[PDB]
Amino acid sequence: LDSFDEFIQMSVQRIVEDAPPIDLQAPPRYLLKFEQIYLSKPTHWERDGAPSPMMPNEARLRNLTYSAPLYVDITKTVIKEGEEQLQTQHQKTFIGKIPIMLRSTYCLLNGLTDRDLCELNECPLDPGGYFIINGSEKVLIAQEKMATNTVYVFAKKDSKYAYTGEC
Amino acid sequence: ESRGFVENSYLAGLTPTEFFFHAMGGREGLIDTAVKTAETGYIQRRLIKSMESVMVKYDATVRNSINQVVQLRYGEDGLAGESVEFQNLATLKPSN
Amino acid sequence: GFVGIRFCQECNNMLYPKEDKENRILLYACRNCDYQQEADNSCIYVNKITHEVDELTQIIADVSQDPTLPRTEDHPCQKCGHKEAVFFQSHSARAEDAMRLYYVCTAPHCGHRWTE
Amino acid sequence: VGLVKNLALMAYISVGSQPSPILEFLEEWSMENLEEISPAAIADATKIFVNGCWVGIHKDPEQLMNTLRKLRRQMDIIVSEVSMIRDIREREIRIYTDAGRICRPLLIVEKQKLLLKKR
Amino acid sequence: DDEEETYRLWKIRKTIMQLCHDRGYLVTQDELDQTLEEFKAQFGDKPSEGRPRRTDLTVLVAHNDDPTDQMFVFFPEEPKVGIKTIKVYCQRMQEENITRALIVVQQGMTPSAKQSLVDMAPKYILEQFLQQELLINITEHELVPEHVVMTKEEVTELLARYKLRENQLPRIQAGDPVARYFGIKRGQVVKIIRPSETAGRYITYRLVQ
Amino acid sequence: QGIEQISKVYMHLPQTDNKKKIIITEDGEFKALQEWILETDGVSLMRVLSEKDVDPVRTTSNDIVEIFTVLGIEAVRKALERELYHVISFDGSYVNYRHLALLCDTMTCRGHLMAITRHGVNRQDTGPLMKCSFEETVDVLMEA
Amino acid sequence: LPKMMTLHQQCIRVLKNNIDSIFEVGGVPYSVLEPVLERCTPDQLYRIEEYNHVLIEETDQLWKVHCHRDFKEERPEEYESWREMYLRLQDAREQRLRVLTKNIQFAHANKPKGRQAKMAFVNSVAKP
Amino acid sequence: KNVTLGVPRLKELINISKKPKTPSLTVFLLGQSARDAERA
Amino acid sequence: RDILEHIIYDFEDPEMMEMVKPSLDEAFVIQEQNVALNFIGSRGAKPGVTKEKRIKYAKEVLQKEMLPHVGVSDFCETKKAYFLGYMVHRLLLAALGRRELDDRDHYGNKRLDLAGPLLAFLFRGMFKNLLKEVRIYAQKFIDRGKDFNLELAIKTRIISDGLKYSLATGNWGDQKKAH
DNA sequence: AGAGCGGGGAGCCAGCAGGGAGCTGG
RNA sequence: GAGGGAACCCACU
DNA sequence: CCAGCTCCCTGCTGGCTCCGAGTGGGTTCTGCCGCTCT
Ligand SMILES: [Zn+2]
Ligand SMILES: [Zn+2]
């Protein structure tokens, strides 16, 4: 839950920031800059198109993906020859759907008491920590890796190197 | 105690350091089983495919599929191994 | 004894050993620029194959602050008389042949390190 | 076997933090930058690593680690999940704020006494 | 050193003449068991000085059944062996009308010299032996069982008894150390007598390939 | 001094009859003689055999290839049998002799050391279908 | 403990285990009390000196053992006994630490701006 | 002596390895050389 | 002198000097920064025919791609030099036996990518893909046309179905690169 | 407009460069 | 009186 | 006299093929969204 909350609150916005703005010339120049993300609560749109607050049992039963729409604020500036810069503020532009970990901050079961969870046909003993993808509960197994930014010196065997430092 | 000698019995119960060191010891046996199965099976397969057509012929010789003589008699005595027994030579050991 | 790197002054590079037969002596010459200098020590290169018998000079006194090191009060400091001292084995790759204990005085401002 | 592992019950994997408060505090807690020092001062001083970045050296590493532990223990500038390691023999202080570090809570002992009291 | 080289020369001569007795050549019992002192008395003590000279160490033997079937054992002084030494040795063989020789080299032979040996093998049979290989008798080792070279009539009786072809027998390489010891060519059959854990004695037959 | 391929030599006096010098006395008993024996960490068998006061009969290696190149094919057959027996009977396990003898005779029937691998088995005169059944199926059938 | 101890050593080892038990020394001279006070830590010395004031002018050299352990880069100036220097630098360092805490909390949270995700509640028809 | 046994030695045997893990000799001595430790 | 000051912090230590002697002897023939950058760029991914192109490529490797954590911006080369000298110093310490070799199985040398970092890696790749497709669409409608609609430029299927696919299958990457 | 379709190791082998005798030629 | 394959994961002896 | 040049041994590097047997159960994806043309 803590890793998913850090990903949603901090990592998505940081990834959007570190992506460079798009500079496009044929001539007219267009600069696209993605500014501020917005994440909603997990909503379902049927074929009618009316949004609804999508519950985890609805996602499990109807084989839905328990995902929340991710909007973003985009600025499009126009740079012509002999013309000032033109600003277009495309506020809250939908760019996809982020699957939501159960009982995380942006899950609809967040902050609910056990009575509210039982009224929603959820088990209060259920830990969360998983996603609902096409109605199937998916857990992300943690993955070990070597630590970054650290100097590690080993001795490669049966090689041309007596010792090797790695970072 | 530091380097993994467990001074307790299973009835007495292990200290936490002894418990962790015993887990380190038993993980070795689990690893040994799991990684020895594949190499042993490959050894068995290679041993089988090297000798599968070697057989006792009707002239009591041991030959392969190429009909080359491997042994002139099976086990050098021509006897099946499911009926020989451990016995003692009476005249080998005693003095003159 | 060991020989160290002697550096040039014009370009601060490495001086390499060389001889002059007109003076018939030894000089450290820089071969990036044209600097030359008469060499003080005749020893150009030395092996220390079995000269790893000492490990006290690599020990620092800061290990007196290590809480994971064993402390004893039966080995008083010779330099200052403090009763307590940490002891440890050598941490080198040369310590495979020796479990010899080294001692460091745990009194501040002393840092005296000795053996047995 | 051995490759798939499980968490211990009180094990917590760190979530990550920004090094900026620790870096600012180190800058005005008598640590001198690498850009402003001659190399001759590096031999006797303690190298300071923040998320594996050598940011400077310190002349008094013991009181620096005491100060850093005091800051982390009262949940000041340093947050609780930050790891601070003093390699005493190698004269290094490594501060890690990144994610993925697995840690566990331990009771603090000062002078052979628990800081956990009956209160 | 002169003493260790004299010991080497005595050991080489003893192994050579054990080999010659094993090959069927007439080597008398007096010169099988020649002691180091007897070798010192007959030949010398200081090979670097030259009292035992390798050229003087040349052994001429005659086969037991055929007294005109003689074989040489040559000891080149030079460590390698070239074409010139081979030409000198085969000229000596031609002028003494002998078709078999052993060449006990110190370091080895040049590849051209081995090519000359295999080229002249139809007329004169010349065997390469390192001194290192000949410093012991490998047939006296406990791992090496008894090898007996079979006559052609024995081979035909063997193949008639077991109704075999030659390629159905087990094989031994012509470069095998025991095969090189007995000086056997391709097509011959060696009868191996060995002890058996189960039967007591077992006889194998190996064709030279 | 010494021989280049041999790094370390371990002297020991064996207390067990596995590596002793059994002799038949004048009375006629089998008497075990405790005699000092050496072990090596490298293999230079021919030089060791040539050395002074080294037994040129009982001295042996555990290297199969050098025993084959020094003493021949029947000697490496016996050495292979001894080493396989050592591996089997380390645990006190017993396998009947005919199985070990058949494996060693299979590995030494063609004059050289035929390894129990594709490079030993698939280079015999056996049919292409047997070879492709073992290993390198497509390559064997293309060679055929 | 395979050691023999006379009365001095017995009393000072017991008291060297429980320094904290001392409230008021009575009338012991420092020259007697010299061992147990050298194996001690400066807060306990402040406690002892503020219950047993008559020891103060005796213990100042003792403070040097603390000063070169806590302020090893320093030296006293003139008209500075080691106790008053240790207390002045100790309180100055605590005040510097408190000012730094109130800086890097105020100037990192309240002063600058950090960007994160905000809740939408849009329910947009951009995904129909 | 660190002589290898078990499955790795069986693999080193049935695969004719030119590089055994622990190659070794068992050197036996002749005469008085075998009887005293100094000439051994 | 400067290189050894960055590598060897105590110049009164002769064995570190002895071990850095072969590297100094090997690299004596290069004596300028531009010649060294040329030597680096001669062994690049694609060596440029222009020497100045090789200088730019070597500078880009040494700044952007060599030790990004100590510094990636311009004029941050002294921190990178101290860190590289620290790596060489650690290598010499291991060579002397003065410092123990690192342990791969030591679990303080390991980090655990949880749902956060893994989803961040996914979303970084897929936001790069979404910006790539937006760039292609807007490039097409500024090349022949004059204007492009941004709402039609964004393919939400990229982020949505990529996250859905990687969470559904467990293959952590792209759909066309599952192997 | 809208229906349907084209675009990790471990151990073998051979193939190359480096060596080092040795015949023909002056 | 019997119409998919493939990939991956978990598990069993 | 003595320089010249060709063809077999060793060694390094690259390719290449192998890595236990047998069982349950699951999910996902194959098979894709731009069209040019009436
Ligand atoms: Zn210079
Ligand atoms: Zn002291």
From Swiss-Prot, chain B:
Protein name per the record: DNA-directed RNA polymerase II subunit RPB1
Subunit details: Component of the RNA polymerase II (Pol II) core complex consisting of 12 subunits: a ten-subunit catalytic core composed of POLR2A/RPB1, POLR2B/RPB2, POLR2C/RPB3, POLR2I/RPB9, POLR2J/RPB11, POLR2E/RPABC1, POLR2F/RPABC2, POLR2H/RPABC3, POLR2K/RPABC4 and POLR2L/RPABC5 and a mobile stalk composed of two subunits POLR2D/RPB4 and POLR2G/RPB7, protruding from the core and functioning primarily in transcription initiation. Part of Pol II(G) complex, in which Pol II core associates with an additional subunit POLR2M; unlike conventional Pol II, Pol II(G) functions as a transcriptional repressor.
Compartments, record wording: Nucleus; Cytoplasm; Chromosome
Domains: entry comment: The C-terminal domain (CTD) serves as a platform for assembly of factors that regulate transcription initiation, elongation, termination and mRNA processing.
Post-translational events: The tandem heptapeptide repeats in the C-terminal domain (CTD) can be highly phosphorylated. The phosphorylation activates Pol II. Phosphorylation occurs mainly at residues 'Ser-2' and 'Ser-5' of the heptapeptide repeat and is mediated, at least, by CDK7 and CDK9. POLR2A associated with DNA is specifically phosphorylated at 'Ser-5' of the CTD by CDK7, promoting transcription initiation by triggering dissociation from DNA. Phosphorylated at 'Ser-2', Ser-5' and 'Ser-7' of the CTD by CDK9 (P-TEFb complex), promoting transcription elongation.
Region (Bridging helix): 15-56
Leader sequence residues: none
Domain of life: Eukaryota
Homology family: Belongs to the RNA polymerase beta' chain family.
Complete-protein stretch covered: 818 to 913 of 1970
UniProtKB/Swiss-Prot annotation, chain C:
Keywords tagged on the record: Acetylation, DNA-directed RNA polymerase, Metal-binding, Nucleus, Transcription, Zinc, Zinc-finger
Amino acids binding Zn(2+) 1: 8, 11, 30, 33
Localisation: Nucleus, Nucleolus
ZnF locations on chain (C4-type): 8-33
Binding sites annotated in the UniProt record for Zn(2+) 2: 77, 80, 105, 110
Main location class: nucleus
SUPFAM superfamilies: Zinc beta-ribbon
Residue intervals of every TFIIS-type zinc finger in the record: 73-115
Single GO term (MF): DNA-directed RNA polymerase activity
The UniProt record lists the keyword Acetylation: yes
GO biological process terms on file: maintenance of transcriptional fidelity during transcription elongation by RNA polymerase II; transcription by RNA polymerase II; transcription initiation at RNA polymerase II promoter; transcription-coupled nucleotide-excision repair
Domain of life, source organism: Eukaryota
Gene Ontology cellular component list: nucleolus; nucleus; RNA polymerase II, core complex
Function: DNA-dependent RNA polymerase catalyzes the transcription of DNA into RNA using the four ribonucleoside triphosphates as substrates. Component of RNA polymerase II which synthesizes mRNA precursors and many functional non-coding RNAs. Pol II is the central component of the basal RNA polymerase II transcription machinery. It is composed of mobile elements that move relative to each other. RPB9 is part of the upper jaw surrounding the central large cleft and thought to grab the incoming DNA template.
Subunit note: Component of the RNA polymerase II (Pol II) complex consisting of 12 subunits.
Family, per entry: Belongs to the archaeal RpoM/eukaryotic RPA12/RPB9/RPC11 RNA polymerase family.
Protein name as catalogued: DNA-directed RNA polymerase II subunit RPB9
Source organism of this protein record: Sus scrofa
Swiss-Prot record, chain G:
Ranges where the record places region BC-box: 6-15
Annotated localization: Nucleus
F-box domain span: 22-66
Region annotated Activation domain, chain positions: 1-128
Task of the protein: SIII, also known as elongin, is a general transcription elongation factor that increases the RNA polymerase II transcription elongation past template-encoded arresting sites. Subunit A is transcriptionally active and its transcription activity is strongly enhanced by binding to the dimeric complex of the SIII regulatory subunits B and C (elongin BC complex).
Domain comment (free text): The BC-box, which mediates binding to the elongin BC complex, has the consensus sequence [APST]-L-x(3)-C-x(3)-[AILV].
The protein's assembly and partners: Heterotrimer of an A (ELOA, ELOA2 or ELOA3P), ELOB and ELOC subunit. Part of a multisubunit ubiquitin ligase complex consisting of elongin BC complex (ELOB and ELOC), elongin A/ELOA, RBX1 and CUL5. Interacts with ERCC6; the interaction is induced by DNA damaging agents or inhibitors of RNA polymerase II elongation. Interacts (via BC-box) with CUL5.
Name assigned to this protein: Elongin-A
Taxonomic placement: Eukaryota, Metazoa, Chordata, Craniata, Vertebrata
